[PDB]
């Protein structure tokens, strides 16, 4: 047994002991009103949770048959009459209030950290200010060409190539007067302007108002701060260092204001199944909101003299979302009286919610996340406006609880599901008064639309659905929604992750194409990352994108509808077999150290051994493409079986470098991930929303319990 009982529900000890011990104190709130709201919001909003899931059900059954027995004006007219396919509500504005600027102003790049991991929530709350002499030194960004090759020590031809890439970077976004900073001699702030001593006549800013502050002494200062697109960069100041000796200005290292906000990962990228683990990801949560967690600390404020003389502080972390998990899933950490698991989703809301107010305040611990009074949350795999409707009125009952001025919980939709996508204008509406992002995505999305459109039979391979006409609206959609109800100065609209983590040149190369789309924000998987795409939101003005495309409609309801079909034979026998590897593969990488060793975010070698940073979306989409060719008769449940048995081998020689890790091959019947994975693709049709979280909820329960025995 080992739990309480509250009401009707029975808690995890762990959990109720967590909650009474630590994140109860200091809020104000009485212990004894706060686990009586948790039993009357469970009670409450459990029959309207399960009406919703049904609902979901209902259509995806109407939309199977549809297909069995089969224009798009048919089509949409079936949609529109089955309930999936809402009308437009008449334009309007969001009037979401009490946002921190990071959130309705300033354009950037976005980390997402998985919250159970201490030490990348650490790093990732400490991005905000990275180096940019370490992202280029030590990524291919800097070509490793003969010559410049990264070695165990450090290369100076290489570095000689770090320091003209950012001294090309400072020339583009705050340009001097006349000349370029690539001929430096030194910095000085004489009468609260910046003075750049060239080697001959010396110069100010081309745009005076892009010098922000500096460090040290004003006649000799340690530091200079810039501001571009307002983002600010910091030219730090020493010629006593290893690199600013060669340096023909003294230039120590350029800094970057990168990674402005981050969210805080409850899903995708962890593996928590149970109480003790909901319960370590709480801890890391509560601790990230007191400003007390430590493995490595928190970053403190960074102090500045402005121009004109005063003091100023900036804010030495990023400001933090906390990514909750979806409406799907119930969780044992509380189960009532007839023994059933209580919805994940709303015991989220509740936990961390009531955690977060601790962010708002300073002392007891030191440090604060949202000056303005806002906790924000993210919410997933929604399905349509009922559903985003439904989360509101969570937060407002959750609001009640913990004492909370109303709309204190702002919602952070993800646009991530087929019935989201062609809804949005409504499901926007919906949390009006709420909503402080949107955002698209590849994983989850695709997932969706092959599970969706399943019986219309076989789809395009995975790399083909990246450029597919229905995502490609999508995502211009997405923009389109947002920018007409008024997100441009109030709200960011955000993008997907690059997830190829070693390919650095190719992210500075490519994913600039998302501010150039009017995305205010994307996401990136390392602080590294976040540094080097810093540099896309200095060359692209995302204010003015925006202001250029408010009123155009890119997207038609016909082109987001348009489902990725194969064409006729579109494949050799070889091209189907490669898929298939790939798809295998993809899934028992990914799904071995899940089910093995709790582990939802990591860098997993692909079939081309790439690096990959990937969540656990990479699962539905490749069990789902897997479970379509099956389904339609392009490959045999033998392929499969050979397939898994192919890479498995592939996939244990991958984990070399792991002491933990235990080897899935010779022997597969008896490796629970790797009958997991086999699960995942010979049941994926039947799967709710082709969601994974079931089967692996279940496959890892079994490793710990067996590993308990
Ligand atoms: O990859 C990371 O840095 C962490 C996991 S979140 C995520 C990964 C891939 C696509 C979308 C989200
Ligand atoms: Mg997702």
Same mark, same amino acid.
């Given at each position: 047994?080992?739990?309480?009982?509250?009401?009707?529900?029975?808690?995890?000890?762990?959990?109720?002991?967590?909650?009474?011990?630590?994140?109860?104190?200091?809020?104000?709130?009485?212990?004894?009103?706060?686990?009586?709201?948790?039993?009357? $919001?469970? %009670?409450?909003?459990?029959?309207?949770?399960?009406?919703?899931?049904?609902?979901?059900?209902?259509?995806?059954?109407?939309?199977?048959?549809?297909?069995?027995?089969?224009?798009?004006?048919? !089509?949409?007219?079936?949609?529109?009459?089955?309930?999936?396919?809402?009308?437009?509500?008449?334009?309007?504005?969001?009037?979401?209030?009490?946002?921190?600027?990071?959130?309705?102003?300033?354009?950037?790049?976005?980390?997402?950290?998985?919250?159970?991991?201490?030490?990348?929530?650490?790093?990732?709350?400490?991005?905000?200010?990275?180096?940019?002499?370490?992202?280029?030194?030590?990524?291919?960004?800097?070509?490793?060409?003969?010559?410049?090759?990264?070695?165990?020590?450090?290369?100076?031809?290489?570095?000689?190539?770090?320091?003209? !890439?950012?001294?090309?970077?400072?020339?583009?976004?705050?340009?001097?007067?006349?000349?370029?900073?690539?001929?430096?001699?030194?910095?000085?702030?004489?009468?609260?302007?910046?003075?750049?001593?060239?080697?001959?006549?010396?110069?100010?800013?081309?745009?005076?108002?892009?010098?922000?502050?500096?460090?040290?002494?004003?006649?000799?200062?340690?530091?200079?701060?810039?501001?571009?697109?307002?983002?600010?960069?910091?030219?730090?100041?020493?010629?006593?260092?290893?690199?600013?000796?060669?340096?023909?200005?003294?230039?120590?290292?350029?800094?970057?204001?990168?990674?402005?906000?981050?969210?805080?990962?409850?899903?995708?990228? $962890?593996?928590?199944?149970?109480?003790?683990?909901?319960?370590?990801?709480? *801890?890391?949560?509560?601790?990230?909101?007191?400003?007390?967690?430590?493995?490595?600390?928190?970053?403190?404020?960074?102090?500045?003299?402005?121009?004109?003389?005063?003091?100023?502080?900036?804010?030495?972390?990023?400001?933090?979302?906390?990514?909750?998990?979806?409406?799907?899933?119930?969780?044992?950490?509380?189960?009532?009286?007839?023994?059933?698991?209580?919805?994940?989703?709303?015991?989220?809301?509740?936990?961390?919610?009531?955690?977060?107010?601790?962010?708002?305040?300073?002392?007891?611990?030191?440090?604060?996340?949202? *000056?303005?009074?806002?906790?924000?949350?993210?919410?997933?795999?929604?399905?349509?406006?009922?559903?985003? %409707?439904?989360?509101?009125?969570?937060?407002?009952?959750?609001?009640?609880?913990?004492?909370?001025?109303?709309?204190?919980?702002?919602?952070?939709?993800?646009?991530?599901?087929?019935?989201?996508?062609?809804?949005?204008?409504?499901?926007?509406?919906?949390?009006?008064?709420?909503?402080?992002?949107?955002?698209?995505?590849?994983?989850?999305?695709?997932?969706?639309?092959?599970?969706?459109?399943?019986?219309?039979?076989?789809?395009?391979?995975?790399?083909?659905?990246?450029?597919?006409? &229905?995502?490609?609206?999508? =995502?211009?959609?997405?923009?389109?929604?947002?920018?007409?109800?008024?997100?441009?100065?109030?709200?960011?609209?955000?993008?997907?992750? &690059?997830?190829?983590?070693?390919?650095?040149?190719?992210?500075?190369?490519?994913?600039?194409?998302?501010?150039?789309?009017?995305?205010?924000?994307?996401?990136?998987?390392?602080?590294?990352?976040?540094?080097?795409?810093?540099?896309?939101?200095?060359?692209?003005?995302?204010?003015?994108?925006?202001?250029?495309?408010?009123?155009?409609?890119?997207?038609?309801?016909?082109?987001?509808?348009?489902?990725?079909?194969?064409? =006729?034979?579109?494949?050799?026998?070889?091209?189907? *077999?490669?898929?298939?590897?790939?798809?295998?593969?993809?899934?028992?990488? !990914?799904?071995?150290?899940? $089910?093995?060793?709790? $582990?939802?975010?990591?860098?997993?070698?692909?079939?081309?051994?790439?690096?990959?940073?990937?969540?656990?979306?990479?699962?539905?989409?490749?069990?789902?493409?897997?479970?379509?060719?099956?389904?339609?008769?392009?490959?045999?449940? %033998?392929?499969?079986?050979?397939?898994?048995?192919?890479?498995?081998?592939?996939?244990?020689?991958?984990?070399?470098?792991?002491?933990?890790?235990?080897?899935?091959?010779?022997?597969?019947?008896?490796?629970?991930?790797?009958?997991?994975?086999?699960?995942?693709?010979?049941?994926?049709?039947?799967?709710?929303?082709?969601?994974?979280?079931?089967?692996?909820?279940?496959?890892?329960?079994?490793?710990?319990?067996? %590993?308990?025995?």
């Amino acid at each position: 047994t080992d739990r309480v009982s509250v009401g009707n529900l029975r808690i995890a000890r762990v959990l109720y002991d967590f909650v009474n011990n630590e994140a109860l104190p200091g809020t104000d709130i009485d212990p004894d009103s706060f686990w009586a709201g948790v039993d009357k $919001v469970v %009670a409450d909003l459990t029959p309207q949770n399960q009406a919703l899931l049904n609902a979901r059900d209902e259509l995806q059954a109407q939309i199977d048959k549809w297909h069995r027995r089969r224009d798009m004006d048919a !089509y949409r007219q079936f949609l529109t009459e089955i309930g999936y396919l809402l009308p437009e509500p008449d334009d309007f504005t969001i009037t979401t209030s009490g946002v921190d600027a990071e959130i309705t102003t300033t354009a950037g790049p976005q980390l997402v950290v998985p919250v159970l991991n201490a030490r990348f929530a650490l790093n990732a709350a400490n991005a905000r200010w990275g180096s940019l002499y370490d992202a280029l030194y030590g990524t291919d960004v800097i070509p490793e060409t003969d010559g410049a090759e990264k070695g165990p020590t450090y290369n100076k031809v290489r570095g000689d190539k770090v320091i003209a !890439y950012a001294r090309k970077f400072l020339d583009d976004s705050v340009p001097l007067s006349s000349g370029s900073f690539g001929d430096a001699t030194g910095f000085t702030v004489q009468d609260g302007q910046l003075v750049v001593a060239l080697p001959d006549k010396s110069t100010g800013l081309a745009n005076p108002g892009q010098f922000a502050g500096y460090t040290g002494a004003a006649e000799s200062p340690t530091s200079v701060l810039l501001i571009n697109h307002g983002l600010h960069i910091e030219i730090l100041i020493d010629p006593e260092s290893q690199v600013g000796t060669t340096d023909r200005a003294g230039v120590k290292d350029v800094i970057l204001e990168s990674a402005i906000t981050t969210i805080m990962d409850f899903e995708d990228s $962890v593996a928590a199944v149970d109480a003790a683990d909901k319960v370590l990801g709480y *801890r890391n949560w509560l601790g990230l909101n007191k400003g007390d967690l430590a493995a490595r600390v928190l970053n403190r404020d960074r102090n500045y003299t402005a121009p004109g003389g005063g003091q100023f502080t900036l804010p030495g972390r990023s400001l933090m979302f906390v990514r909750n998990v979806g409406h799907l899933m119930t969780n044992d950490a509380i189960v009532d009286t007839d023994g059933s698991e209580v919805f994940e989703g709303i015991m989220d809301a509740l936990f961390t919610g009531l955690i977060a107010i601790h962010g708002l305040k300073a002392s007891d611990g030191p440090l604060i996340n949202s *000056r303005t009074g806002s906790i924000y949350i993210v919410k997933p795999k929604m399905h349509g406006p009922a559903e985003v %409707a439904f989360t509101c009125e969570l937060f407002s009952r959750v609001e009640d609880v913990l004492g909370l001025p109303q709309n204190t919980m702002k919602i952070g939709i993800m646009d991530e599901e087929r019935r989201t996508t062609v809804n949005l204008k409504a499901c926007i509406k919906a949390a009006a008064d709420r909503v402080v992002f949107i955002n698209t995505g590849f994983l989850d999305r695709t997932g969706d639309e092959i599970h969706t459109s399943m019986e219309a039979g076989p789809m395009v391979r995975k790399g083909t659905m990246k450029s597919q006409p &229905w995502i490609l609206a999508y =995502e211009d959609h997405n923009v389109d929604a947002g920018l007409a109800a008024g997100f441009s100065g109030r709200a960011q609209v955000g993008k997907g992750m &690059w997830t190829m983590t070693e390919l650095m040149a190719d992210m500075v190369e490519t994913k600039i194409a998302q501010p150039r789309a009017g995305a205010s924000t994307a996401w990136v998987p390392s602080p590294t990352a976040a540094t080097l795409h810093a540099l896309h939101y200095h060359q692209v003005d995302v204010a003015a994108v925006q202001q250029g495309l408010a009123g155009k409609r890119r997207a038609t309801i016909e082109q987001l509808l348009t489902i990725p079909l194969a064409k =006729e034979l579109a494949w050799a026998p070889d091209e189907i *077999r490669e898929e298939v590897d790939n798809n295998c593969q993809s899934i028992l990488g !990914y799904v071995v150290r899940w $089910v093995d060793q709790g $582990v939802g975010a990591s860098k997993v070698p692909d079939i081309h051994d790439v690096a990959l940073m990937e969540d656990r979306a990479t699962l539905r989409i490749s069990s789902q493409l897997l479970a379509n060719w099956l389904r339609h008769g392009v490959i045999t449940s %033998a392929d499969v079986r050979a397939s898994l048995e192919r890479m498995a081998p592939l996939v244990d020689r991958q984990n070399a470098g792991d002491v933990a890790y235990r080897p899935m091959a010779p022997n597969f019947d008896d490796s629970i991930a790797f009958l997991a994975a086999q699960e995942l693709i010979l049941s994926g049709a039947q799967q709710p929303n082709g969601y994974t979280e079931p089967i692996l909820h279940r496959r890892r329960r079994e490793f710990k319990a067996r %590993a308990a025995e």
